[PDB]
Design an enzyme around this catalytic site. Sequence first.
Site, mmCIF file in Angstrom:
data_model
loop_
_atom_site.group_PDB
_atom_site.id
_atom_site.type_symbol
_atom_site.label_atom_id
_atom_site.label_comp_id
_atom_site.label_asym_id
_atom_site.label_seq_id
_atom_site.Cartn_x
_atom_site.Cartn_y
_atom_site.Cartn_z
ATOM 1 N N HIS A 1 19.452 60.417 34.145
ATOM 2 C CA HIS A 1 19.979 61.014 32.939
ATOM 3 C C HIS A 1 19.797 60.038 31.795
ATOM 4 C CE1 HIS A 1 21.836 64.218 35.200
ATOM 5 N NE2 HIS A 1 22.455 63.326 35.951
ATOM 6 N N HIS B 1 12.408 63.838 29.373
ATOM 7 C CA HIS B 1 12.458 62.631 28.505
ATOM 8 C C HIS B 1 11.257 61.687 28.579
ATOM 9 C CE1 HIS B 1 16.735 63.722 29.193
ATOM 10 N NE2 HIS B 1 16.618 63.785 27.894
HETATM 11 N N1 LIG Z 1 23.552 59.559 22.512
HETATM 12 C C1 LIG Z 1 22.763 60.628 22.458
HETATM 13 N N2 LIG Z 1 22.181 60.950 21.278
HETATM 14 C C2 LIG Z 1 21.386 62.026 21.230
HETATM 15 N N3 LIG Z 1 21.056 62.872 22.201
HETATM 16 C C3 LIG Z 1 21.644 62.530 23.359
HETATM 17 C C4 LIG Z 1 22.487 61.455 23.564
HETATM 18 N N4 LIG Z 1 22.904 61.413 24.887
HETATM 19 C C5 LIG Z 1 22.318 62.442 25.444
HETATM 20 N N5 LIG Z 1 21.541 63.165 24.574
HETATM 21 C C6 LIG Z 1 20.760 64.355 24.885
HETATM 22 O O1 LIG Z 1 21.201 64.849 26.127
HETATM 23 C C7 LIG Z 1 20.116 64.971 27.079
HETATM 24 C C8 LIG Z 1 20.485 64.214 28.331
HETATM 25 O O2 LIG Z 1 19.673 64.687 29.436
HETATM 26 P P1 LIG Z 1 20.239 64.527 30.939
HETATM 27 O O3 LIG Z 1 20.487 63.043 31.131
HETATM 28 O O4 LIG Z 1 19.148 65.064 31.848
HETATM 29 O O5 LIG Z 1 21.511 65.351 30.993
HETATM 30 C C9 LIG Z 1 18.837 64.503 26.374
HETATM 31 O O6 LIG Z 1 17.881 65.557 26.358
HETATM 32 C C10 LIG Z 1 19.259 64.078 24.961
HETATM 33 O O7 LIG Z 1 18.599 64.795 23.940
#
Ligand SMILES: Nc1ncnc2c1ncn2[C@@H]1O[C@H](COP(=O)(O)O)[C@@H](O)[C@H]1O
Length: 128
Positions: A123, A15
């Site tokens: 996260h 990210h």
């Molecule tokens: N509200 C949200 N809208 C869009 N994508 C999300 C959202 N929450 C989580 N994600 C996706 O989920 C992933 C979370 O990464 P992690 O926190 O490492 O599990 C990210 O790569 C985002 O693309």
Amino acid sequence: KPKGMTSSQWFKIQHMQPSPQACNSAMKNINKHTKRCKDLNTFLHEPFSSVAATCQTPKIACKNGDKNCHQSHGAVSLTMCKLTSGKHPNCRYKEKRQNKSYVVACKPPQKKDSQQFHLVPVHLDRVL
Ligand SMILES: Nc1ncnc2c1ncn2[C@@H]1O[C@H](COP(=O)(O)O)[C@@H](O)[C@H]1O
């Protein structure tokens, strides 16, 4: 997460993208550690220190009920990379560049973390 990685380094790799990059090149740094193509991934266009500062916001509830989530002060430039085709690792993506706030779950860094802020993101809980 990949074995041997600290939580915040995996967060960085998935990210953190201050210099915007094309989805199809950037997603390879993620899928080289995964067994299938990630379907949706958000890159935040900010340095790590300014997401680390977001962890200094008031505690809020995460999606899963944890209470270690933190909302950004405001919106930032970000890119969403949605999967459209390909069998891993030949993943192909369509991009969407927006301006939105985000919510991150944070904890203290681990001993191996190169940037010892007292709280680091681990996260991405939301894109508001
Ligand atoms: N509200 C949200 N809208 C869009 N994508 C999300 C959202 N929450 C989580 N994600 C996706 O989920 C992933 C979370 O990464 P992690 O926190 O490492 O599990 C990210 O790569 C985002 O693309």
